[PDB]
Amino acid sequence: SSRHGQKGVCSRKWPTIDMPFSETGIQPDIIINPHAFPSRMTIGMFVESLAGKAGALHGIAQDSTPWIFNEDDTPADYFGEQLAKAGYNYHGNEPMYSGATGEELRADIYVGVVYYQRLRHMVNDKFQVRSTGPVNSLTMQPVKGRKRHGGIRVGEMERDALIGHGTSFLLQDRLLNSSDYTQASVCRECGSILTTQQSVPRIGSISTVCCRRCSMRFDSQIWEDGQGNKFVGGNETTTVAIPFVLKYLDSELSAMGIRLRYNVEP
């Protein structure tokens, strides 16, 4: 930024050969678009460019304290007199040449010397990319934090916009498939996702998925527990695809004494 609020990021490091060169052989080190000026109306930057060039030529320092000029004694007049005396033109325009083609440009370019400040808002503390990483403990969603390999949040307004496109698959991929997708187990009859468990096996058997709500204390349909509580019960469970935050919400509601039956279709 300059001292007039004309902030702006740097797009590309333009090579000096492709930079436009003036008739005196000097290529500017900062290029600012002329379209930044008409809306802001920072004419002080133009006056500073004029006075900076004049002072650099004459070896003097130009004071820019406000209200040292008036309508009769214009800074444009003053610094233009200095530039014309130094041999450059009154209006601060320099005939420049295209650095890529070589021909002289249509009109004289406005050049000068202005004081520039570098701000601490650098892109090296802004960029962040996540493919996988540390997930949360209860929601099993990506953690928050640039330094933690954490993901970004697609929130309420982003979801509403993603619906407005009619792209329900974009919504699925954002909010479920890439955030907390899980292939849990659900009881067909109980309709509950949490009261199921992986039964411990016996010698040679294979662990299966059972349920505790639709089971009563006690050969083929006998499944045991780690703590020795063997009993026959729910042997009819499926695997649906749900967000894990749904399972956390189910646990929280069960803490409130509320039940949610999940009616599995087939």
Binding site: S11, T16, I30, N33, P34, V111, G112, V113, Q117
Partner: protein, 57 residues
């Protein structure tokens, strides 16, 4: 590397801001030439940047 401004108020010396140079003087052309600096972006000469222009730690 900071520089004392060519254009500075008379109060710049009184508060001794020369002891703390904030930025640098640069040759700035108000030109629409690159096409990469339209909205508010700006273009920095690569050779100047390769001579320690605006460098900081």
């Amino acid at each position: 590397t900071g520089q004392t401004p060519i254009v500075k108020a008379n109060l710049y010396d009184d508060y001794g801001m020369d002891n703390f140079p904030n930025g640098f003087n640069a040759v700035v052309a108000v030109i629409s030439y690159t096409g990469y600096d339209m909205d508010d972006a700006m273009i920095i000469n690569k050779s100047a940047d390769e001579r320690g222009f605006g460098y900081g730690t």
